[PDB]
Design an enzyme around this catalytic site. Structure first.
Site, short mmCIF file in Angstrom:
data_model
loop_
_atom_site.label_atom_id
_atom_site.label_comp_id
_atom_site.label_asym_id
_atom_site.label_seq_id
_atom_site.Cartn_x
_atom_site.Cartn_y
_atom_site.Cartn_z
CD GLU A 170 -3.16 -1.04 1.34
OE1 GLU A 170 -3.59 0.12 1.44
OE2 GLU A 170 -3.89 -2.04 1.10
CB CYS B 158 -1.65 6.80 0.89
SG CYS B 158 -2.90 5.85 1.80
#
Lengths: 452, 452
Positions: free
Chosen positions: B226, B260
């Site tokens: 991720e 993110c």
């Protein structure tokens, strides 16, 4: 890249490898094809997939002849391989849309769900041992999901690789949706590093898998690896011994031993070991060795001279260390890469061969005293693909299922792949799952959607 | 490894890194712990996981203070982070057993199914930006599944890393089931290469992810990554403009911009762009910058001096190339690593910043003329994590959902993670999914069982 017939050793046809510019051109076309193909309906994809199955079903014998000519598996088992290739095409035609349907979850959203969309270009690196089946096992769910694919097949099965592309073209899949790359191992790096390539899958050996997976990891790309195994075939006192011998013989010797899920290490409870081993010895001894095109042949040649050299050395070094040859153990004196069904017993502790994959019809045999020792020995390898155990005691059955460290555990049958059930390894045999639902979920974007 | 308070710049505590021998000892203990832990019942695992949630729920404020002291996020958002960590513990306590239940499929077998078993030791490499939530997001399903875990946390959040282990100890998880490794980036290779470590997951930036994934690939080990994003926040003429400005401001500036899934690129339809931008400008200018321990503070300092230096340079170079600063754009002249909420417009095509992640409260703003242009611009990045689009036209909503190249698409809301739904990236944002069913299925052996 060449067809070299392993039955005769004859070089039949040579092929020119693509240049990097030609590889680039094929990737550009795949990317263009993907932009349109991702928009096709499941009905179109299903039509083309079912057409591909019909082509395989009609011409099994011709396709099988290509497999046998290039890599030496019996023509009859190559017919079965073409049939199984058709089967996995039909499986994803029949289930793929359902398998990719939106999955809704209740939240405070008006609508929240996961949908499934293709990633784009998938690279597949495939091995020579099941030159149609391994390809179709990947290609059918890939194409049903709306991905496009480039295939790097083994360098010794170029006609098989070209035939798979030809089948998919004749089926109606648009140009660029599936492309065979006539390229060597050294050329795979360019494909993995291409920004248009989104994922990669490899079936084969560890060195190739480690290279592909490490390169893909550097590029932040997902992979699936299906590598080798040294699957145990455990036989306990309540087993049907005759069935276990018959099935075990098939499991070790099918595809001339060249299968990641072959039964490689036979682990025999001492109470039945003498009887089972004698019967296994007898069954191996009467397998028919010869021209794989002949319908009566059980054992054709190994696929390459390299495989023959490797198994010969492996067995020779085991014997020098003290292992006993019950049967076989020496390359046959005839044209072609022939190695006979072989049984090795009394293998010394610490022999290197105990930790290696024997990719040839060579069984290692062990005796154990109880369930705990059987499980310990079965797991005492770097691999973890499949496992087979024979017993009719429910408690033993459950312990084998629970404790054998493998991706697949079969009780009272040989390990087989089946489109209806997922298939893959653990440990050094790889990761990820093909077939079943898993096969079509691996290389898709699971996109979470939340609508106020 | 050290706690350095980003609000003051002061070094609070230094920690000794583990030696390779100490790392090896932790891995030996994890392996021993796994052999017992894989045998625990779901009821025991669920008890310990719920105990962990209750600890997090009781002491949110203290845990939040550790987060704020070490990495500078507001104390109030760190409280929310502790709460969300408890939530994902409860989610897998409540659903994990069901999520791992045998799945049966009809074949000619008496019984054929897939069961789900743990892999063993999982390595997690986690980042400083959500130092509790990212860890619990991985740890709850890992532990419910029967895996054990070793954590390499960011070197600037050692107290957070130690607190997570302490919480899991107090909850009752046996020794060796979860271990924090006080180690630096250079020491991760030893862990990935250790034969007892079976898989690895990393949340963070591309260089770290590429290193971990490439090393793991060489070792034939599965990963989940991720990584960063440059998520679009698209606002079209039928949007509720005031809600979109309010929510967009939160999306870009929450966690001091360091997420993110922050809204990083605002893509505004020309019909509403002038109104939206002015309101965005005023909303950003009203944000309270200061001591993150104060409840009124919106924007604390960036977590490290390196992050501050990086965003400062990125903005400076964009401006030199011709970008306009509507707001902010220079580091604050005060103690601590403070960078103000910033809005950049009129960014020249070909400017490098267009392709970079801005890990700070810096919004890039663009104007587009139609849906096709919005989608093209939204996707014209190397990343593909989240996407948010604002419109009340059903046809536009469906096109945004279908065509935005991201792992998550939110319509009329900001992208957020929720334990109930899978979460992950595509493209250079990574692969694999955490949360929902996927989070607990990622690092298990899906074992196919066939019983005659």
């Amino acid at each position: 890249i060449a067809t070299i017939n392993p039955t005769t050793g004859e070089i039949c046809q040579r092929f020119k490898a693509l240049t990097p510019a030609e590889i680039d051109a094929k990737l550009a076309k795949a990317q263009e094809a993907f932009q349109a193909y991702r928009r096709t309906s499941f009905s179109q994809r299903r039509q083309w997939l079912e057409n591909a199955a019909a082509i395989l079903e009609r011409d099994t014998s011709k396709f099988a002849e290509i497999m046998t000519t290039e890599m030496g598996k019996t023509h009859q088992s190559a017919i079965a391989e073409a049939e199984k290739s058709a089967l996995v095409c039909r499986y994803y035609a029949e289930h793929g849309e359902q398998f990719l349907a939106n999955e809704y979850t209740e939240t405070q959203a008006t609508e929240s769900y996961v949908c499934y969309q293709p990633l784009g270009i998938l690279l597949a690196v495939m091995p020579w041992n099941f030159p149609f089946w391994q390809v179709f096992r990947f290609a059918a769910p890939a194409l049903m999901a709306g991905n496009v694919a480039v295939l790097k097949h083994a360098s010794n099965v170029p006609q098989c690789a070209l035939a798979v592309e030809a089948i998919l073209e004749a089926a109606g899949f648009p140009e660029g949706v599936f492309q065979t790359l006539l390229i060597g191992a050294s050329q795979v790096e360019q494909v993995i590093k291409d920004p248009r390539v989104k994922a990669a899958t490899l079936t084969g050996s560890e060195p190739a898998g480690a290279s592909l997976a490490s390169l893909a990891g550097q590029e932040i790309k997902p992979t699936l690896l299906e590598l080798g195994g040294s699957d145990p075939f455990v036989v306990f006192p309540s087993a049907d011994l005759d069935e276990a011998v018959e099935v075990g013989t098939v499991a070790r010797t099918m595809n001339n031993g060249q299968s990641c899920i072959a039964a490689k290490r036979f682990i025999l409870h001492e109470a039945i070991a003498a009887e089972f081993l004698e019967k296994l010895h007898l069954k191996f001894a009467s397998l028919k060795i010869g021209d794989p095109m002949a319908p009566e042949t059980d054992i054709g040649p190994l696929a390459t001279e390299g495989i023959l050299q490797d198994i010969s050395r492996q067995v020779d070094q085991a014997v020098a260390a003290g292992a006993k040859i019950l049967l076989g153990g020496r390359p046959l004196d005839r044209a072609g890469y022939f190695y006979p069904p072989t049984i090795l017993t009394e293998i010394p502790p610490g022999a290197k061969i105990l930790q290696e994959e024997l990719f040839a019809p060579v069984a290692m045999v062990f005796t154990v005293k109880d369930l705990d020792q059987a499980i310990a020995l079965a797991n005492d390898i770097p691999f973890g693909l499949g496992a087979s155990a024979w017993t009719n005691d429910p408690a033993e059955q459950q312990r084998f299922i629970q404790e054998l460290d493998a991706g697949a555990v079969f009780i009272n049958g040989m390990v087989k792949s089946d489109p209806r059930l997922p298939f893959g390894g653990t440990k050094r045999s790889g990761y990820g799952r093909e077939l079943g639902l898993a096969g079509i979920r691996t290389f898709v974007n699971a996109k979470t959607v939340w609508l106020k």
